[PDB]
Design a protein around this nucleic acid. Sequence first.
RNA 1: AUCGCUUCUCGGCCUUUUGGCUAAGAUCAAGUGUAGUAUCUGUUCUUAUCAGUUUAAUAUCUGAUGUCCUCUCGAGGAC
Lengths: 144, 250, 151, 121, 81, 77
Amino acid sequence: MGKDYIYAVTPLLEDALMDRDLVHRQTASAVVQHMSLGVYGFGCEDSLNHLLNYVWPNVFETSPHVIQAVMGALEGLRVAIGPCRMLQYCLQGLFHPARKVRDVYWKIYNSIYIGSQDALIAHYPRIYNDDKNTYIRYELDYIL
Amino acid sequence: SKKKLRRMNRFTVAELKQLVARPDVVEMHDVTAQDPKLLVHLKATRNSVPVPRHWCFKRKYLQGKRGIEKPPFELPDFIKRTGIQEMREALQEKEEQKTMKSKMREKVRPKMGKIDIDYQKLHDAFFKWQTKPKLTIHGDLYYEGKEFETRLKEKKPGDLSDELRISLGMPVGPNAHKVPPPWLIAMQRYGPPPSYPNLKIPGLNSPIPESCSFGYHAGGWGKPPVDETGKPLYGDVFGTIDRTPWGELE
Amino acid sequence: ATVYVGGLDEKVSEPLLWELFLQAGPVVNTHMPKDRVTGQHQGYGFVEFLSEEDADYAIKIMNMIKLDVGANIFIGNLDPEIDEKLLYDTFSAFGVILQTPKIMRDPDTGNSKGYAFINFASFDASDAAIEAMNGQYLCNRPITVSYAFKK
Amino acid sequence: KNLPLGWDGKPIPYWLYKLHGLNINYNCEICGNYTYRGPKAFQRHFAEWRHAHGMRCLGIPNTAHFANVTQIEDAVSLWAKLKLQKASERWQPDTEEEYEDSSGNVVNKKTYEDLKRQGLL
Amino acid sequence: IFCRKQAGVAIGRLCEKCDGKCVICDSYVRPCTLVRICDECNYGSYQGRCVICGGPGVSDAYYCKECTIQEKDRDGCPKIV
Amino acid sequence: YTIHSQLEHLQSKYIGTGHADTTKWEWLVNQHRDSYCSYMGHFDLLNYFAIAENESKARVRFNLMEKMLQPCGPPAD
RNA sequence: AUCGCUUCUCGGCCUUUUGGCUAAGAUCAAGUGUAGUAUCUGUUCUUAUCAGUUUAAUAUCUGAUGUCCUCUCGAGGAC
Ligand SMILES: [Zn+2]
Ligand SMILES: [Zn+2]
Ligand SMILES: [Zn+2]
């Protein structure tokens, strides 16, 4: 029965995810986690998308509690919003120059993969084939 | 040094920009990445969402928000309407005036049920006037200072406001059509945009808005800008199915 | 490209400023980088329309848009169809207005016969403004301005 | 000491100068061989004026696609293939939109109207 | 620290201090499914103990309905040994 | 870092995960194998392919499980 | 010198200002475990390349800082 007050509460969480403090963003993230697990399956996915926009920047963080509540928010948000949306958030930073960003994105993508590794089969991008390998999946584009 | 030979593999940003099929993406540090052809194909895929700004920065996430002063959170309308805020303001002022001794006296002899606010006011706010806030669709991460600009990308000319009309000298309301703004005056006088122009001004390069008036006093359309041979400044300054949804609730 | 927003109105917000920039043409920059103390508008701003002729005609258009040692100037053949704030902004392009334009209108009706007087900042300000608008294009009855008489 | 300015116009202290890394200079050929200290400074310059001018006079608009391409031969070959692609994905009715004459054989829009209004079709 | 050596058919139990919370989610509500542990963390002096306190097995460790919605309950004996 | 003992135990636990250095080859080959295991599991994409080519379900799954061995070219170096 | 106005300075009032009494009326005043985050506070950094380590890039780290005469690290020169 959060499908009712999700709208009332969003502009307060976006308010507190635009900084106020570490603990401010740690706590707004916990709230996002539990909203997502409650509203699983009732269509209030536009609101959780909106709040993804604000939670995902905290991904580069260091404090244990803060980054941990962030990761929790992203597992909740993974079941509630689906694994396409989150694989798309996780696409570009898998192969980044840096190593702090490579490592956080591979941490996330690992947890997105463990749970729901089987949806992703229809969510992976199209990755062209160079000379001595084959990389396209022709299985999937047989016409019929 | 082996990292240094791969560093000689560390191609030019022009190397990249010319190789790649979609050159918008290519950025600064892209090249020190172990697999830039991938990285760039990824960053040029559809619908994907780029890394935040602030991994480079030395300042942490919103320590840059540190400086300013900020105004308290603003409730939803349908919750103000039910008039909670005034109850709470009143109780606040009461208990800030009252003194310690009286505080404990009220602890031991409570003012039971000082106030009331009935239900169906609440239950109708939350179940009858609750409404969709403004949400942002997939991708638009919030970064520092983003709210610093309220809204944009209405390059359209017809976009006018009522306070805009008032504090510019033009009319608000049903007369926002029949009111050519003070900028359409010099639109008619010396023109629109030299290399932009894809905007037509109403009453100056467009026809009369509904029931407009030709004349040279305050409140009209004046001379629709035309050549000496009769062709207007541009355009025409004078002027010469079943969309029902299938599954929808009663 | 770069245009001087003169008589830059205080509360006339840079947001609607840029919306008018777009409603005229290439809204690329609307900026009035103000006093480091005040925050309000600083009387002259930079409006960049990334096309030169765009900014030129946008300027010709958004001019006249309605955004004591004798520094008072008499201004006649007066346009009766103006408002207070718009007239003050137009007069103030060459200086401050220490008295908004007092229009010598008849009292029987409330409609003017075509004269006024305006306290500007400087006598050279009244000079320059009355010069650029000597006989020049007023709203309906062309302007005629100079140093004002004393009553 | 070449110490960069602060708001209050003094030297910037040394650990701070090292942080900001002013030592590193970027040869922007588009900007009259202008050369920049400060990396984000360099980057914003790509939309700053001097780069804008550079572009205009190069004969190529200041669209993002070339930002961070600073050498002019690279720029022109880049914008060359870009031009080719824009002309490709344009639908041009002249060469695409095609017309049969009455005689059971086909031409394009252009040639159809050409021989049409020069007195046969 | 986790046992995680894979699951079985032996129920787990709770001391009375630990009475009521889920094993990981640390909830207090709406428990849906029973907990199972491994033989190795099942045997001997570890028969009927508190997966958390180590106290005596009296009440039944359960699984918060969130943990079952996300199937974090399909990994096996989560005993902090 | 005992977390890491457990975490490269997790890498040892779930074939297809990653770490910050993972190569385009391991990534795309793992996704390719998973694609095959699911074309086999789901009883209906099998009909889709069986019918798309003119093969028969034994033929289909035999191809698939042969391909499962080097699906995306030969290895990286 | 006198009159008036203004400016500053100084003196004088400044009781116009310490509710009465007793046994000074009497008496007296007692808390965490763990870590860790953040914030203050205190402090510390021009030196000249180059090689490497390193890093998204910096940085860090490591390592030395043209010969000959000669006069006082410094100087004029054959070079
Ligand atoms: Zn649990
Ligand atoms: Zn065990
Ligand atoms: Zn217990």
